[PDB]
Every structure is written in C-alpha cells, then in structure tokens.
Amino acid sequence: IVGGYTCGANTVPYQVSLNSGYHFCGGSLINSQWVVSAAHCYKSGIQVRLGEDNINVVEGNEQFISASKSIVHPSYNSNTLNNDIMLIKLKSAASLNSRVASISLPTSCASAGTQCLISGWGNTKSSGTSYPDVLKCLKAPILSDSSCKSAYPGQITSNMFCAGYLEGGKDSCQGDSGGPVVCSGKLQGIVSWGSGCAQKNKPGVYTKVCNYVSWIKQTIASN
Numbered sequence: 001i002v003g004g005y006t007c008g009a010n011t012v013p014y015q016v017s018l019n020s021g022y023h024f025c026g027g028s029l030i031n032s033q034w035v036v037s038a039a040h041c042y043k044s045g046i047q048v049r050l051g052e053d054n055i056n057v058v059e060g061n062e063q064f065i066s067a068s069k070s071i072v073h074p075s076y077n078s079n080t081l082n083n084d085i086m087l088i089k090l091k092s093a094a095s096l097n098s099r100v101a102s103i104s105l106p107t108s109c110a111s112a113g114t115q116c117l118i119s120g121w122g123n124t125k126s127s128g129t130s131y132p133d134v135l136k137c138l139k140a141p142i143l144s145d146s147s148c149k150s151a152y153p154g155q156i157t158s159n160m161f162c163a164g165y166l167e168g169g170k171d172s173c174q175g176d177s178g179g180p181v182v183c184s185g186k187l188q189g190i191v192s193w194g195s196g197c198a199q200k201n202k203p204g205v206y207t208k209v210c211n212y213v214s215w216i217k218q219t220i221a222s223n
C-alpha cells in the first residue's frame with residue numbers, strides 16, 4: 001500500500017498472508033476452509049497465515065494452516081491477467097473469531113464512487129523500495145469503467161475495475177497482490193495489477209469478484 005495508514009492489529013480479520021518461507025501475496029478468508037487470492041499469486045508450498053498484524057513477530061492471534069488444494073480460475077490468462085482469481089482450501093478449518101473472520105461475497109457488483117478498503121503488506125514507496133511488517137490499509141473509490149479504460153487502453157476486461165486516485169500518491173503496490181478490496185462489508189476486488197504504484201493516471205486494477213461468485217460457490221460445493 002502506498003499513501004495508506006497502519007490498519008491496526010487484526011482490524012481486517014479476513015486479511016490472510018500467503019507464506020512460502022516469506023509473505024509473497026495477500027488473500028481473503030471467505031469461510032473456515034477457503035481463501036480467495038490472485039491466480040498470478042499461484043505457486044506450491046503455500047501456508048496460509050491468519051490473525052496476522054506483524055508478519056515478522058508471533059503476537060498471539062495467528063493461525064498457520066497449509067493449503068490442501070489450489071484452484072486457479074479455468075480461464076486465467078497470465079499475459080493479460082484476465083480472470084486473476086484463485087481459491088485455496090486449508091488442510092483444516094480455521095477457528096473463526098473477532099480477529100479471524102470470513103468476509104461476505106457480493107450478491108451484486110459495486111459501482112464507481114463506492115468507498116472501499118484495500119489492505120496488504122506490499123511496498124509503501126511509488127519510487128524506491130520499503131516493505132512494512134504490519135498491515136496497511138487504504139480507503140479508495142471505485143473509478144468509472146470509462147476512466148479505467150482511458151488510463152489503460154486495450155488492457156481492461158469486463159472482469160477488471162480500477163480503484164483509487166488519478167492524481168496519484170495513493171495505490172496498492174508489489175506484495176499487495178491477492179489481497180482484499182472490501183466495499184460496504186462485501187469483497188468486490190482482488191489486488192491484481194498496475195503500472196508502477198501511485199503514479200499519476202495509473203490507478204490499481206482489481207479482479208471484479210462479483211463476476212466469480214457462481215464459480216466460487218459451485219467450486220466450494222464440490223472440493
């Protein structure tokens with residue numbers, strides 16, 4: 001997150017860290033056994049870390065559980081990042097509580113202008129590099145389909161939306177990928193891609209989770 005604020009320990013109870021010896025991606029807990037992340041986050045040897053503020057310190061609310069199964073979207077294209085969504089099932093169900101809680105899936109697509117909360121452990125600098133160990137949050141409006149396409153000609157599909165600020169200074173960044181965009185209690189976005197971070201006229205691009213609910217419910221139902 002660039003231009004963000006320190007969320008507060010466990011204030012984003014659906015925020016997961018995907019670990020392979022190190023945090024490499026975000027994810028969102030959608031029930032006791034299942035995480036939604038970015039398909040571009042896919043690799044093997046994933047441990048899901050829940051109840052996490054400082055990913056470098058054992059602070060006392062963590063649940064560490066290995067991925068049993070990963071399911072990349074059948075139509076995920078790694079070149080275009082179209083359908084940048086993936087499901088990870090846990091070996092065991094997490095204990096849900098105030099600090100580790102599922103986030104609701106959308107029953108409807110959110111609209112441009114809606115305030116959303118973007119979180120993750122990604123880079124905090126638009127130029128240079130610096131990673132935070134505590135979770136960062138950013139409040140961001142969804143931008144119009146048309147201003148998204150203007151910013152990124154030939155690149156935005158019907159499964160993407162932009163959120164943030166055209167003036168720049170405030171964006172998601174490297175290490176935020178797979179992390180949530182929650183809008184009015186509902187998971188509307190996955191941190192997907194962008195041209196640099198927090199650059200003028202280059203906002204964050206997010207997987208449009210409302211397109212994928214059928215797939216998520218049907219997949220959870222049989223796996």
Ligand SMILES: [Ca+2]
Nearest residue numbers: 054055057058
């Ligand atoms: Ca920790």
Ligand SMILES: [Cl-]
Nearest residue numbers: 004005006007
């Ligand atoms: Cl702060």
Ligand SMILES: [Cl-]
Nearest residue numbers: 214215216218
């Ligand atoms: Cl389906």
